[PDB]
Every structure is written in structure tokens, then in C-alpha cells.
Amino acid sequence: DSRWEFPRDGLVLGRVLGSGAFGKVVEGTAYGLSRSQPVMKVAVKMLKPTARSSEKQALMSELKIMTHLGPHLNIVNLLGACTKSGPIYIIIEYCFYGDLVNYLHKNRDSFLGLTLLDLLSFTYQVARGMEFLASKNCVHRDLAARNVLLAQGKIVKICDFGLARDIMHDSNYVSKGSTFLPVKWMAPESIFDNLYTTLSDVWSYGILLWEIFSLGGTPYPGMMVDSTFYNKIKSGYRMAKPDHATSEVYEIMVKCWNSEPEKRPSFYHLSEIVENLLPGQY
Numbered sequence: 001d002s003r004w005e006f007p008r009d010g011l012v013l014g015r016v017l018g019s020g021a022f023g024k025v026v027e028g029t030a031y032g033l034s035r036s037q038p039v040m041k042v043a044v045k046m047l048k049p050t051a052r053s054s055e056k057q058a059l060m061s062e063l064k065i066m067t068h069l070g071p072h073l074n075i076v077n078l079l080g081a082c083t084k085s086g087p088i089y090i091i092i093e094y095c096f097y098g099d100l101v102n103y104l105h106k107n108r109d110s111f112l113g114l115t116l117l118d119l120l121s122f123t124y125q126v127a128r129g130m131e132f133l134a135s136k137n138c139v140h141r142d143l144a145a146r147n148v149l150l151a152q153g154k155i156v157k158i159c160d161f162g163l164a165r166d167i168m169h170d171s172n173y174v175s176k177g178s179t180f181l182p183v184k185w186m187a188p189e190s191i192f193d194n195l196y197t198t199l200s201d202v203w204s205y206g207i208l209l210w211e212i213f214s215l216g217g218t219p220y221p222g223m224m225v226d227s228t229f230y231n232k233i234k235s236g237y238r239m240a241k242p243d244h245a246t247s248e249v250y251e252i253m254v255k256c257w258n259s260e261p262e263k264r265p266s267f268y269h270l271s272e273i274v275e276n277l278l279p280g281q282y
């Protein structure tokens, strides 16, 4: 679609927010990208010179998929793109607080500020975002706190850095076969039987909830991903309750970690359940 196209001379590129082996996301400023906000801060995903044609095809397809998702409050907001007469730029609205892991770490010590209600809100918003993606038949496959951004007003924005994360030198991604995988976030059917569904996303959402209510802890702390780890998961091992989880929130996580995928709750039902834990009703 040509509606998305934005001229390069209207885009200022700044510091790198994140980089992988062949892609990167840079902070930027866009001039004339909105009539109402003629000077607006953005993030821009682009390829590095290192990238080959396979990684260039993936960026164009990523743009194509993002155009077809349409907008949702809890997904990163696609604003425009640069495609003609140059390398592909994907322009997204800048999320003030950055990624959720670092946000949780920065606010862990002053936690009562950051409140339990804020954590419940993040939990609810992610579920609403994942519900949207599922409705578009998009399986995330890498849902984790590191792939959740936070905009001002404390609004969750699910994202996927993809090529802009160095999964080869990130401890959260374990070598398996030809590539590196977020094993500690993956459902057993994904690890051992290579099945990726919304229901496997629901497992990852449970791991994400553990991240939130541990205030950014590493899942299965101390445990290396090895054959001992793999066998524990198949045998029904699950993480204990994080410090700042209520019993209700822990029960939600355990439901997400059912060994049988069809027994995990939908992202829609998850939204309702978390809603009843929040004060007030709309």
C-alpha cells in the first residue's frame, strides 16, 4: 500500500535502541508524518549492511503483516514506512518507557511509584493485545516481557524486535538445532513437537505473568536449559509463586501452564478474569 509511504528526507535517525546481527531499531524524529503532530518522536526498524537477502525479505513481509493487522491500543502503532529508492524503514510511534523488563527492574526497589494495580493493568492490557493478535490469526511465538513496550499513560504495547535482537548472545535464547529459541518461555508442544498456536502463546503469557509479578525475574532462576530442564517440564514441573503475585494471579499462571494446550484459557477469557481482580467496573 502506498498510503504508508513516507519520504526519507522527512526522517531523522538517532541512537540505536536495540540491534541484532543484521537488524536494528533506532530512535528518530518524523516531520510531516501527522498533520496534527508535525514533529513526532518515532522508532525505526532497519537492516544493517551485514544483512543478506533472506533478512531483507523478512523485513518487507513484516511490514506487510503489520499493515494488515490494523491498529490496536495494545500493539505497537505502525505509522509509516520507507520502501522506494532505498533500504526498508518501518516507522513506529515511540514508546516512552521502553521495554517492560527494564521498566520493572528500574521500579522494583520502590515497589509499594509502582503498585500491584499497575502490574494487574499490564497483565490485563497484554491479554487484550494478545486477544487482538489471535483474532487476526497472528501467533506471536516470542511473547515475553522483553517484547512488551510501555507508552506514556502506562499503556502496554506488544512488539517483536525480531532481527533487532541479538538472539545469539542473549541468555534468554538457547541454541537448539539451527537457531536460538526462547525455551524458558515456550510451551512443551513447541519445544519438543514444534507446534506453535495461540495456545502456545497462552503458555508464554503465563511465563510473562511470572516475569511481571517477580518484577522482572528470569524464569526458572538458576536452572540452565539442559536435558534436566527439558525432562522436568515434561514431568509437570512449574515455577513457584513470585513474591508479588496474589493467589488469584498465581492460579491464572498455572492454568496457562496446563500440559494439554486445549485446557489453557483463551486470551479473551484471561482478560475477563484479570478484569475482575481490578478495582472498579466499567
Ligand SMILES: *CCC(=O)Nc1ccc(NC(=O)c2ccc(C)c(C#Cc3cnc4cccnn34)c2)cc1C(F)(F)F
Pocket: 017, 018, 025, 026, 042, 043, 044, 045, 062, 065, 066, 075, 076, 090, 091, 092, 093, 094, 095, 096, 097, 098, 099, 133, 137, 138, 139, 140, 149, 158, 159, 160, 161, 162
Ligand atoms: C503475527 C505475528 C506478528 O506480526 N509479530 C510481530 C512482528 C513484528 C513486529 N514489529 C515490531 O514490533 C516493531 C517494528 C519496528 C519498530 C521500530 C518497533 C519499535 C519500537 C520502539 C518504540 N519505542 C521504543 C523504545 C525503546 C525500544 N524500542 N522502541 C517495533 C510486531 C509484531 C507483533 F507481535 F506486534 F504483531
